[PDB]
């Protein structure tokens with residue numbers, strides 16, 4: 001009945017049962033909690049169970065603006081005609097904006113520190129306070145909209161609140177799309193999967209279904225294998241910022257206080273820029289900070305992210321590994337040896353077989369994160385297919401895609417082509433030394449870092465009326 | 466649907482003029498493959514003990530995690546080719562595309 005406390009498997013509960021010799025939970029009468037995702041059609045004996053997307057599938061920066069009209073309205077600064085996003089009124093980060101707080105019933109951020117009394121931040125997406133690094137990116141973007149709605153006001157002083165906001169929102173939305181498709185995706189997929197799945201943009205196609213597919217919500221969780229066991233903070237010299245420069249992850253979840261009180265977003269961004277991501281390896285898939293101690297502080301038990309991903313795929317009725325390989329036009333291994341060949345690793349193949357019995361039953365996330373990485377990419381062929389296919393749909397099927405005719409003028413697009421994540425950091429933080437492009441490859445200081453002086457800024461001259 | 470718009474709706478409604486809910490918030494996901502449920506329509510594999518999938522028993526997600534995923538923190542390999550910003554962009558990006566609500 002109550003999923004956060006009981007081990008009873010009764011709708012909507014689907015608790016993750018505990019196996020023999022568990023390295024953390026000795027009582028097999030216990031469970032890792034799990035609420036099944038809301039059905040699209042509640043209680044139907046007819047239609048096949050599907051889940052809902054609370055968000056716009058488009059790369060439209062809805063994480064900044066909201067996907068529901070009342071939220072979007074509330075995230076805005078309605079005190080004037082400046083078309084700004086609401087900023088925290090109680091706090092600042094070296095005279096710079098922080099996200100405003102949210103008024104939650106049971107607030108998990110307050111639970112991370114009684115003394116501090118720092119609640120969850122309000123943003124377009126509700127998971128903004130999940131970790132201070134994600135919170136830094138949400139804050140980075142809340143500042144870019146306000147900075148653009150200030151440059152546009154000084155350029156077009158006859159413009160009102162709605163115009164400035166809509167025009168700034170549009171630029172942020174395009175920055176998100178550029179970084180993703182020009183910088184992010186090629187490094188996820190690799191060059192070959194990039195040509196195959198994302199050939200050069202032609203134009204908007206109204207027959208391309210832009211919806212997020214159920215499988216993608218699981219396949220895109222490949223990133224859980226890139227997670228580092230600590231949150232790293234570095235000063236202006238890119239040297240550890242003591243005390244607590246490497247704070248374990250299981251102590252940072254919902255720790256919005258660490259942003260407000262422990263130094264703001266700058267020590268966090270420098271950390272993201274100058275720290276290498278974890279590398280996914282067959283015998284080094286995902287860290288115990290997420291596999292054992294996920295939300296440890298705020299729950300009755302530590303959650304297991306890899307296991308939650310596998311329970312979620314079963315709850316979402318997702319076919320197994322081989323059905324997805326077939327869908328991708330990839331050979332489906334039937335035997336242990338055949339899985340060995342696909343995996344380039346017979347030891348992992350033997351283990352997967354012991355667990356699943358057949359490569360037909362291997363859960364999507366599990367079989368996807370197990371495949372050897374494509375050259376210059378961070379996924380194997382199956383995830384590259386699912387990831388690539390989904391992104392082409394969000395691109396080819398977006399009427400408001402930055403390159404679509406009528407969205408931005410040829411002049412506005414030549415100006416937008418100049419954008420970068422290192423520059424957005426420069427323009428909205430006290431950070432003076434940023435990553436050399438590509439920001440996603442650059443992980444070593446001072447070898448991969450350069451000054452803000454060298455970097456071209458975005459020119460809004462083509463936005464003058 | 467408004468005949469002529471300059472900006473997106475917050476909701477994503479009207480982006481596709483023929484099927485205006487497409488890509489819009491608070492709608493069902495699209496399926497690329499038919500759902501595979503124990504009963505065929507709603508119950509997840511592993512919901513019922515002894516109920517097999519393709520003639521093989523259903524592994525516990527926690528057990529697959531213990532056997533396949535579990536590794537000692539000390540062994541961690543830092544990626545010489547990627548920043549933690551690469552991980553972080555992935556999550557922020559994911560948060561622009563999908564959120565599956567629960568009760």
Ligand code: HEC
Pocket residue numbers: 130131216217218220221222223224226227305308309312552553555556559563564565566
């Ligand atoms: C590269 C992408 C990526 C990164 C990085 C990432 N996630 Fe995920 N995560 C996802 C996706 C997709 C989902 C599914 C979200 C949805 O549809 O509701 C998700 C789901 C989850 C869920 C829901 C679990 C469940 O199935 O019930 C948890 C918890 C989670 N992530 C935690 C984290 C945490 C914690 C971090 C960082 C500290 C993080 N994620 C980093 C993509 C990512």
Ligand SMILES: Nc1cc(Cc2ccccc2)c2[nH]nnc2n1
Pocket residue numbers: 126127128129130564565
């Ligand atoms: N479906 C999810 C769930 C969570 C946990 C959470 C839920 C509500 C608010 C904050 C954090 C995620 N954290 N990161 N991606 C996520 N995708």
Ligand SMILES: [Ca+2]
Pocket residue numbers: 055056057058059060061062063561562
């Ligand atoms: Ca969106």
Ligand SMILES: [Cl-]
Pocket residue numbers: 087088089090100101
């Ligand atoms: Cl506030």
Ligand SMILES: [Cl-]
Pocket residue numbers: 213214215216495496497498
């Ligand atoms: Cl699907």
